Amino acid sequence: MPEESSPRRTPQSIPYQDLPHLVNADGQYLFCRYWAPTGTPKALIFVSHGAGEHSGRYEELARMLMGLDLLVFAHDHVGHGQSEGERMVVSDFHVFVRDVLQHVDSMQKDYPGLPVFLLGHSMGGAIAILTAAERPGHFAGMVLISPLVLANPESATTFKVLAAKVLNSVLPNLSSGPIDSSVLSRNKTEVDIYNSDPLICRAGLKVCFGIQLLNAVSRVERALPKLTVPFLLLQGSADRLCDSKGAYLLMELAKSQDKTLKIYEGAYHVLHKELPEVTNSVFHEINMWVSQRTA
Ligand SMILES: O=C1CO[C@H]2CCN(C(=O)N3CCC(C(c4ccccc4)c4ccccc4)CC3)C[C@H]2N1
């Protein structure tokens, strides 16, 4: 008699049968999170995390949104956190967009008729933009926290040179250096938390993944004239990773009739984990913006 094989487990050895999950189109398990209110939800909102991190870092934002009577949901992107896949590798950047859409489509089956919002940060903001551009008119709104629209220009040249080198030869292990954690936030406690979290991948960026992030930048630029979704865009003026010029370009080139930019003077990249004055404002402004569009 044949027997069922041992249960599929996360990269951290936890059986997926013990966790909320979804299987993507490539047969890979994605770890999922849900924060639902006690009453009937006013809307759904998907939270899209950034490169090397994971959905658990959105706990406080998600609980705020749940307190507005939205049903919040998320998953760890392939290659990240508690989801399957080689760490920080993706066959094509569109895998991330496809998987968001699968999760959104699945949730709308269970909660039909509700508006759906997207919230994304950094790489996750690029994913959110491409998700909305693929389905014009489908999403009620998008909250973008320092989305990847243009990378730091000096850093971008580095990834472009390395890309051309790997694109010409066979160098599967080539990587750039790791992201300098000190540029993430002026809040030193949050920098220390980032450096302490075992679910964060702090290795150097593999050139193959950097190529896919360059693909995201190129695709985002082409998507802007197709973007009509309402959005709120939050950007630090001293962001050394996602250059503020990208935020201004998004405001200029998106066709959305409802678009708002808030600049945080002197703030670094991870605005929802910045100095308390900035983080409190970020939470408050997202609260107001979503409240006004779900009332
Ligand atoms: O909370 C967190 C923790 O990790 C933080 C760093 C990674 N990041 C996140 O999506 N990231 C998206 C990818 C960029 C990356 C880059 C840019 C400038 C300098 C070094 C690296 C890049 C690489 C190739 C092409 C384009 C852009 C870095 C930012 C999430 C963010 N948020």
From Swiss-Prot:
Function: Converts monoacylglycerides to free fatty acids and glycerol. Hydrolyzes the endocannabinoid 2-arachidonoylglycerol, and thereby contributes to the regulation of endocannabinoid signaling, nociperception and perception of pain. Regulates the levels of fatty acids that serve as signaling molecules and promote cancer cell migration, invasion and tumor growth.
Other notes: Short-term inhibition causes analgesia, while long-term inhibition causes tolerance to endocannabinoids acting on brain cannabinoid receptor CNR1, and a reduction in brain cannabinoid receptor CNR1 activity.
PTM annotation (Phosphothreonine): residues: T10
UniProt GO molecular function: lysophospholipase activity; monoacylglycerol lipase activity; protein homodimerization activity
Subunit-level organization: Homodimer.
Effect caused by changing C242A: Reduced 1-monoacylglycerol lipase activity
SUPFAM superfamilies named in the record: alpha/beta-Hydrolases (SSF53474)
UniProt keywords, alphabetically: Cytoplasm, Fatty acid biosynthesis, Fatty acid metabolism, Hydrolase, Lipid biosynthesis, Lipid degradation, Lipid metabolism, Membrane, Nitration, Phosphoprotein, Serine esterase
Gene3D superfamilies, alphabetized: alpha/beta hydrolase
GO BP term, example: regulation of signal transduction
Organism, as annotated: Homo sapiens
Tissues of expression: Detected in adipose tissue, lung, liver, kidney, brain and heart.
The reaction(s) this protein catalyses: Hydrolyzes glycerol monoesters of long-chain fatty acids; a 1-acylglycerol + H2O = glycerol + a fatty acid + H(+); a 2-acylglycerol + H2O = glycerol + a fatty acid + H(+); 1-octanoylglycerol + H2O = octanoate + glycerol + H(+)
Matches recorded under InterPro entries: AB_hydrolase_1 (IPR000073), AB_hydrolase_fold (IPR029058), Hydrolase_4 (IPR022742), MAG_DAG_Lipase (IPR051044)
Modification type 3'-nitrotyrosine: residues: Y58
Protein name (record): Monoglyceride lipase
EC number of the protein: 3.1.1.23
Membrane topology listed for this record: Peripheral membrane protein
Family recorded in the similarity comment: Belongs to the AB hydrolase superfamily. Monoacylglycerol lipase family.
UniProt pathway: Glycerolipid metabolism; triacylglycerol degradation
Keyword Transmembrane: no
GO cellular component terms given for this protein: cytosol; endoplasmic reticulum membrane; membrane; plasma membrane
Result when mutating C208A: Does not affect ability to hydrolyze 1- or 2-monoacylglycerol
Pfam family, one: Hydrolase_4
Compartment annotation: Cytoplasm, Cytosol; Membrane
Active site positions, chain numbering: S122, D239, H269
